Design a protein around this nucleic acid. Structure first.
Lengths: 53, 116, 42, 113
RNA sequence: GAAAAGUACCCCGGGAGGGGAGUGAAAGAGUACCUGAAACCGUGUGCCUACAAUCCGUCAGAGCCUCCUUUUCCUCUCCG
RNA sequence: GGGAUGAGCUGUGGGUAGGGGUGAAAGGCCAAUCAAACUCCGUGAUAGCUGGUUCUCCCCGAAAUGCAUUUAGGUGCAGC
RNA sequence: GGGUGGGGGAGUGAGAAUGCAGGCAUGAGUAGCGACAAGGCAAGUGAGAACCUUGCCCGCCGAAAGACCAAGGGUUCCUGG
RNA sequence: ACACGGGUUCAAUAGGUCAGACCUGGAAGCUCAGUAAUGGGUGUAGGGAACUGGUGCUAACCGGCCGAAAACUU
């Protein structure tokens, strides 16, 4: 099985554009000193000081 | 504990067994193990049960655990300090905390530790 | 059975060595062609 | 109107479209929140970009004399860099070509109260 | 580049790389270097597009948007 | 799965070289190709067959028919 | 380094030869990432570590995944960086 | 994959504990018979995977994001 023809520039860009990463963040993250922001998932570790930058 | 759906860890279930035993050994000998989250999840009820047997305390409990952990020094520690210490608690002796991922495999890492 | 070539430099010298080229009139004419082209010989 | 500062990195060993995938997350976003995002990007290829944005902060604040807290990523580029190539053997003597694509990343930052 | 005058110094950065200064007539002359084409990738932006099938155009052709002349007029008019 | 003290397997060193060699013969093997191996030279070979031949304008404007062919998928004379 | 004009002379005009050399695209961030021995943990180095290091467990060949010669390779050994 | 369903500390959805259902079929130690192999008692035991029902013991995070502000006739 092979591509019989080139995919038009339009459709190739549509498929290429349907390739993205997710966005997750949290504000109001209180740790020792500066309130560095993390994601919710690792918030508990941040409260325990188990992160590094 | 309960069987696990899907693939066994690493290779077959025999390898999974060896993994859980050695991680359990490290846990009792340190108190804080940083590993992958799936393995920590699987590790909970196993160590939880072992601690339950330590809390009870008996010869046949030593036989039962020794069927799993060939090393004895950790059993001495378990049946001397840990079990009795956690005697004043009815289950739920572990805790799992989410950890920042590993650059190289994006592993959802996690640390499992004893409540105290 | 599954092989292609098993090198042995002694044999290579006795078979393809320029000494053997010198042995014959034909071999000498080969060498003289290589000199003009400018190549390192065997 | 918007006295922007510019920073860029050349000859980066990162594939263009992968960089595009990262930088699409930060268009129009603030510097400090964008860098936080890149710190927690699971893509594990945002590092260099974060370094570049950091250079935007250093230039904007020190050379230009602006306040980092107000900086906004006006625009970001994922330009196609010098592609090299290295050959790979396959079955039946087929000599295929594996490419080593690079990029040039340009970042423009500006104060937008 | 005629000439090495090879961007001292300072600032990001592990470094590479970059920026501000500076040399140079020129850096739109930075070893990857005269001019730097096209395919190609990409950013921004004016217009169209999620009830519609035609080598992907042409001719009719609405209404928006850029620019622009005359003009009622804004008479603030010795300004536009 | 077969042979596995025999017409055995294997390493080392040696010989047979192209219309020739070798061959418990199959027309296979001789540097992944063998009903005559490879490189070079004559060589810019040849081919009644295929394929390609680069910018424009203006006027005019065919045939697929006959005769002959070691010829009918070509060519010659004639016709247009 | 070229224009205007009269002349001379051409490797002279590319749209295709499953053409050649170079560069870049679609397919596509897909497939593949190389025996059905298996890794795990702690501390440490480090800007950065599942893959290097030091310890401790686990697992595998063991008439070979061990230890030695030839042929061959011809600095691939060690130290430091 | 994603999606879907329930729950998210006024909570029993998940994991654990305890007690049951159910499967296995009588654990180790002790004691007794025997020279031994082995058999009885302690013991319908001991161990246990999903299922059932209680038990707030750990983890659901003292929190983020996106999401209307309406032209007229009749």
């Amino acid at each position: 099985a092979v591509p019989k023809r080139r995919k038009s520039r339009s459709n190739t860009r549509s498929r290429r554009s349907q390739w993205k990463a997710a966005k997750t963040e949290l504000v109001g993250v209180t740790v020792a000193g500066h309130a560095h922001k993390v994601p919710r998932r690792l918030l508990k570790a941040a409260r325990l000081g188990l992160i590094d930058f | 504990p309960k069987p696990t759906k899907g693939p066994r860890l690493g290779g077959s279930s025999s390898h999974q067994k060896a993994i859980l035993a050695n991680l359990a050994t490290s846990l009792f000998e340190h108190g804080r193990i940083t590993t992958t989250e799936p393995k920590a999840r699987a590790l909970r009820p196993y160590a939880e049960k072992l601690i339950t047997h330590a809390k009870k305390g008996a010869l046949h409990n030593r036989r039962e655990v020794l069927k799993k952990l060939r090393d004895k020094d950790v059993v001495h520690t378990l049946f001397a300090e840990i079990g009795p210490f956690f005697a004043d608690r009815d289950g739920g002796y572990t805790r799992i905390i989410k950890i920042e991922a590993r650059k190289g495999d994006n592993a959802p890492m996690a640390v499992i530790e004893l409540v105290r | 059975g599954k092989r292609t070539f098993q090198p042995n430099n002694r044999r290579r010298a006795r078979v393809h060595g320029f000494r053997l080229r010198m042995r014959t009139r034909a071999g000498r004419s080969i060498v003289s062609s290589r000199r003009r082209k400018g190549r390192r010989t065997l | 109107e918007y006295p922007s500062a510019v920073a860029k990195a050349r000859f980066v060993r990162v594939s263009p479209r992968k960089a595009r995938r990262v930088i699409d997350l930060v268009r129009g976003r603030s510097v400090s929140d964008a860098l936080d995002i890149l710190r927690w990007a699971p893509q594990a290829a945002s590092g260099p970009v974060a370094k570049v944005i950091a250079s935007a902060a250093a230039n904007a604040q020190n050379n230009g004399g602006l306040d980092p807290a107000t900086l906004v990523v006006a625009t970001v580029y994922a330009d196609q860099g010098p592609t090299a190539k290295r050959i790979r053997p396959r079955a039946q003597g087929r000599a295929f070509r594996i490419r080593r694509r690079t990029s040039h990343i340009t970042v423009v930052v500006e104060s937008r109260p």
